[PDB]
Design a protein around this nucleic acid. Structure first.
Ligand code: FES
Ligand SMILES: [K+]
Ligand SMILES: [Mg+2]
Ligand SMILES: [Mg+2]
Ligand SMILES: [Mg+2]
Lengths: 108, 168, 110, 215, 51, 119
RNA sequence: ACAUUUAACUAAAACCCCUACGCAUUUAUAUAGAGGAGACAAGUCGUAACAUGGUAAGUGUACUGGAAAGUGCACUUGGACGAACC
RNA sequence: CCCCACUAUGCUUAGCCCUAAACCUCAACAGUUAAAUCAACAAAACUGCUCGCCAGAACACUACGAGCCACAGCUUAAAACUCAAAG
RNA sequence: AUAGGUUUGGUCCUAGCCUUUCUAUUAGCUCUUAGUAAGAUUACACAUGCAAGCAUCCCCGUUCCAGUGAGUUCACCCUCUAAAUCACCACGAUCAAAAGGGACAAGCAUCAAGCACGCAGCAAUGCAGCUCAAAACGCUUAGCCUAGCCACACCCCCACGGGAAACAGCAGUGAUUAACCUUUAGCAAUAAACGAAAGUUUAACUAAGCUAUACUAACCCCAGGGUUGGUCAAUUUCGUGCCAGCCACCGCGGUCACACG
């Protein structure tokens, strides 16, 4: 653009940073509503443990449960964080292991 | 690269090289130059190069420019007292014009030196406080004083926890 | 003087004469673009008191700040019609000019 | 550009000011005191401990003038304070008295007078202060002459004091630096400074007044 | 003094101009007359053509 | 800011760290915070002795004259500092305190001499 | 909305227009029901595109078809025409 | 897709509608072939000046809003979810 | 940026997304112990302790300080001129409101017209103008340009009166959050109150108690977190067999996995 055009337009402003599934929060606290397994997209093939939780903001979301083996049942309090599961489309939250009812993974 | 012809005119260094700081009396400067005509060559170079330099050192003076309104390029200054100052600038190089107006309406070197001295007095080297305004912040930054308990923990004697253990 | 009005002297161009004994004047001031470091003209309108209603749309006039604002928006008066629209008198020679041409030769009537 | 007028603010502003005038508390109401608890029932405040005795002891200004014809216009009245602490006669020459008609005993109100110190009468009469204080004591007529007897003491007083250490050292150098060789000890003119007594009656016109609301 | 000096400078410049203006017109006039004479000749010839 | 009543006062602004005070002579308002806005800084005061054993009291005396000439008041500890400096006379209560101390210490020699006599 | 005074040998008392929820208005959230897109990738039906893609492709527009799409009219090359004569 | 037949339509008149690969996808004006031409390809690389446009893909010549003689229209024109590419 | 990884069968050019760097908050796992600096998520409710008195009666203070960030071009300049302070019916400086003139956030133009927003006249009345694509008028976001300032003080912008008994003063609570300080002393320092004053209060403040939030200093004893396919410093042997699980990006795993445990 010309200098006259660059003046008339001004600074480049900025796209207002879109919030994440966690709503700009380090973590969020949810209530387990159900626990199921969703199969990843190809080329990958598995049955990844997810769970639908109701966040403290009202919005319900599917959260991936990391680690090997979970003991989460309905109406339990979990702490969820960010970080998308690259294999599972749509899943974008992750249960924190070792907080509230979700305990650490058993050694064996 | 930077846009425009002669991009140097859009740099602070070039804008701070202006030597014409009008007296407090000058309020409005009008430039009536011509766009064509060899006689007015100096007049338009002054508008191309120096009006940026003038307006910078003189941010409150209203500079106004008019093209091809009269057969001759001329300046005019409006002083606060009500005196107006026609400076005919036909057949005169832009640097000559730059020095002409400096002579008749520019501050002398004495006035500028005096103003620079005022800034020196604002920053008193002794005043302690935020480095945004001062040199040092505490007096523990002066050599040979009592240091700050942060870097070097002071003797238990000086600390108000063990001299109070001696009080009680 | 004690002029309460901020802008004491300002040269502008008449852009309106519909109001009574008041000329609307446009005043442009070069402002520094901080990013591009180029000066562009930022314009604002000023109401000027013209008791004699001698201003036409297109005259370059000089406005002097009134000691006290006459009206809500009238703070200046017509100090001088610097350039009369199409009736400019060469301020260097004093001879009537039409644009960049001396209408009457300076040698005709001295 | 335009600001929304805060109208209710202005309404209540006027309303409050007016209502205070209409409900002005009287001197008999403001300056009443319970001699049992030694607290003014209006504001429930305890007077200072060093005033407890004097309160129960002496009497107020218009407590004396209450029983005098025209409230003793033209009569000379001094206060216990002046008497006890100072020997020079100090008194008020009463000129006008506005008693508080609401008082059951007419022992409250205002009073004006002219102070005459060392034979100099003030150009105007001004209100008497501490009217509610239990200090005032009426001068018996038959000894007015003895009480008003005053002998002008000699005016011999101090005229100039030495400068403090640092200032003196600096003034000299200024003189010396300029070129003045005169070694005349620089001093002040404290004589001009009239050191008024600390207990001199102040201007009641500048003193405030309690609001209708105790709080 | 500086304002009086400026006016003298403007006056000095005015003399240089007023002389220059005269010299240019004197030379132009001779050139102008020749151009006008050329025009007249062309017009006269063309008038003969129509006649 | 516009305060509802007050006067220019020359005070000491408390800086420094915990158990490490350091004062700043400042011309402020009678209602501004102690460490808040001030009009002008008129010096400093190190209340703790330096490596050479002195208390360091810088005083912009030239400007102190101007501020006092405009109505600047002075706080109690500030008055006492100008006394010890010699710019103002010694504070009255300062003297009375020395006397009280010396009269306390008069009692002390009576009691301390006895202690040494016994043991 | 009304203002109408007493007092007056020191001068002082008295001195207050009243009016507020039509769930009106404003912007959202929830949705009986109806659609759309995207993802997902082993179903079904055809084979439109990519080669002259087996009728070159597409643009606008119109009409017409289970579905890709078909056809008209104009336009484009982001097709080609084999590059002396034959 | 091929053949035959026939209509709207193509024409005139009077109003609408306002869209195209409306693309020679290459703006107007003033200039330069000197340099280092110069990513590829295409129709060689550039300077001054101004205006108009653009800022991953796809959602999207879409939705809402607004205007319009246009009511299956046109012009302006997003977002959410999705992707690690698209080109 | 001194850059790097990633489009493809491959190569160039564009291009976005990531990586490497520095902070702050929260979590997991750890967490010997010395100074200093900081320390509710919430303008949503509070146990009911404590924070405004001093002064020989008046007056003065309690309007400051300390809080909070809900609302928000009233913060800065200029012109006039208050109220304060300078012992003073005189009256000049300093300081600083109201008023007048300029200046002054960020997005959205799919917010394009606003709807009386102007001038003249001493007036009665005449004029019909004023702003605006160089962004008027709106809508939504935000305390701000930290020697600090602005705004707010239980809601109704305000607070006569209503709604109702108010901690956005300190310490402390069940609630609500990812967001876990003590129901400690003292007025000698300390500034601010009160009389001229000895002086007398102050949850301001000064000293302490807590908290790996950060910064210095430490040790005979006192090391754990994460990572180890490439980008990117650094895996031996076993189980697992597209399962279980793992990645910030490319991507690993199908019985010989440096990528999982
Ligand atoms: S910085 Fe000087 S006492 Fe801490
Ligand atoms: K086809
Ligand atoms: Mg096909
Ligand atoms: Mg085909
Ligand atoms: Mg084809």
């Amino acid at each position: 653009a010309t200098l006259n055009q660059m003046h008339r337009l001004g600074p480049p402003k900025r796209p207002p940073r879109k919030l994440g599934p966690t709503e700009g929060r380090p973590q969020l606290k949810g209530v387990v509503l159900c626990t199921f397994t969703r199969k990843p997209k190809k080329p990958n093939s598995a049955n990844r443990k997810c769970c639908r939780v109701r966040l403290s903001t009202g919005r319900e979301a599917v959260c991936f449960i990391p680690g090997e083996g979970h003991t989460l049942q309905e109406h339990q309090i979990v702490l969820v964080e960010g970080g998308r599961t690259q294999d599972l489309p749509g899943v974008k939250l992750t249960v924190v292991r070792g907080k509230y009812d979700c305990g650490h993974v058993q050694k064996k | 690269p930077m846009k425009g012809r002669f991009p140097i005119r859009r740099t602070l260094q070039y804008l701070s090289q202006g030597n014409v700081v009008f007296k407090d009396s000058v309020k409005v400067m009008t430039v009536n130059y011509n766009t064509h005509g060899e006689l007015g060559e100096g007049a338009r170079k002054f508008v191309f190069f120096n009006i940026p330099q003038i307006q910078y050192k003189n941010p409150w003076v209203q500079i106004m420019m008019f093209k091809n309104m009269t057969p001759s390029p001329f300046l005019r200054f409006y002083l606060d007292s009500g005196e107006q100052v026609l400076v005919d600038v036909e057949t005169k190089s832009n640097k000559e014009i730059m020095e002409h107006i400096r002579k008749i309406l520019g501050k002398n070197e004495e006035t500028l030196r005096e103003e620079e001295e005022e800034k020196k007095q604002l920053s008193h080297p002794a005043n302690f406080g935020p480095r945004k305004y001062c040199l040092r912040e505490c007096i523990c930054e002066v050599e040979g004083q009592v240091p700050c308990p942060s870097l070097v923990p002071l003797p238990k004697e000086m600390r108000g926890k063990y001299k109070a253990a001696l009080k009680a | 003087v004690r002029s309460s009005v901020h802008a004491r002297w300002i040269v502008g161009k008449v852009i309106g004469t519909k109001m009574q004994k008041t000329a609307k004047v446009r005043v442009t001031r070069l402002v520094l673009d901080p990013y591009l470091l180029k000066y562009f003209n930022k314009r604002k309108t000023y109401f000027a008191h013209d008791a004699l209603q001698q201003c036409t749309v297109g005259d370059i006039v000089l406005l002097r700040a009134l000691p006290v604002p006459r009206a809500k928006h009238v703070k200046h008066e017509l100090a001088e019609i610097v350039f009369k629209v199409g009736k400019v008198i060469d301020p260097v020679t004093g001879k009537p000019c039409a644009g960049t041409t001396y209408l009457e030769s300076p040698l005709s009537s001295e | 550009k335009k600001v929304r007028p805060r109208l209710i603010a202005e309404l209540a502003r006027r309303v409050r000011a007016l209502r205070e005038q209409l409900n002005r508390p009287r001197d008999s109401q403001l300056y009443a005191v319970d001699y049992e608890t030694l607290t003014r029932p209006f504001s429930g405040r305890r007077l200072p401990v060093r005033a407890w005795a004097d309160v129960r002891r002496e009497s107020r200004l218009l407590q004396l003038l209450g029983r005098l014809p025209l409230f003793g216009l033209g009569r000379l009245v001094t206060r216990k304070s002046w008497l006890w602490q100072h020997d020079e006669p100090c008194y008020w020459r009463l000129t006008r008295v506005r008693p508080d008609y609401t008082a059951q005993n007419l022992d409250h109100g205002k009073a004006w007078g002219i102070l005459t110190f060392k034979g100099k009468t003030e150009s105007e009469a001004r209100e008497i202060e501490h009217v509610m204080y239990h200090d005032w004591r009426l001068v018996p007529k038959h000894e007015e002459e003895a009480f008003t007897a005053f002998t002008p003491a000699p005016e011999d007083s101090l005229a100039s004091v030495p400068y403090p250490p640092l200032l003196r050292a600096m003034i000299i150098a200024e003189r010396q630096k300029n070129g003045d060789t005169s070694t005349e000890e620089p001093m002040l003119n404290v004589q001009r400074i009239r050191m008024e007594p600390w207990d001199y009656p102040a201007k009641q016109e500048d003193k405030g007044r309690a609001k209708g609301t105790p709080v | 003094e500086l304002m009086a000096w400026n006016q003298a400078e403007n006056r000095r410049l005015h003399e240089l101009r007023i002389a220059r203006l005269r010299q240019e017109e004197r030379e132009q006039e001779q050139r102008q007359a020749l151009e006008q004479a050329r025009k007249a000749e062309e017009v006269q010839a063309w008038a003969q053509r129509k006649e | 800011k516009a305060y509802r009543g007050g006067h220019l006062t020359i005070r000491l602004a408390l800086g420094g760290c915990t158990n490490r005070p350091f004062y700043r002579i400042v011309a402020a308002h009678n209602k501004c915070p102690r460490d808040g806005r001030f009009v002008e800084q008129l010096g400093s005061y190190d209340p703790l002795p330096n490596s050479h054993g002195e208390k360091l009291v810088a005083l912009n005396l030239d400007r102190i004259r101007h501020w006092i000439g405009c109505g600047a008041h002075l706080s109690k500890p500030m008055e006492k500092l100008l006394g010890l400096a010699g710019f103002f006379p010694l504070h009255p209560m300062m003297i009375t305190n020395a006397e009280r101390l010396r009269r306390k210490r008069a009692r002390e020699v009576l009691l301390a001499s006895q202690k040494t006599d016994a043991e």
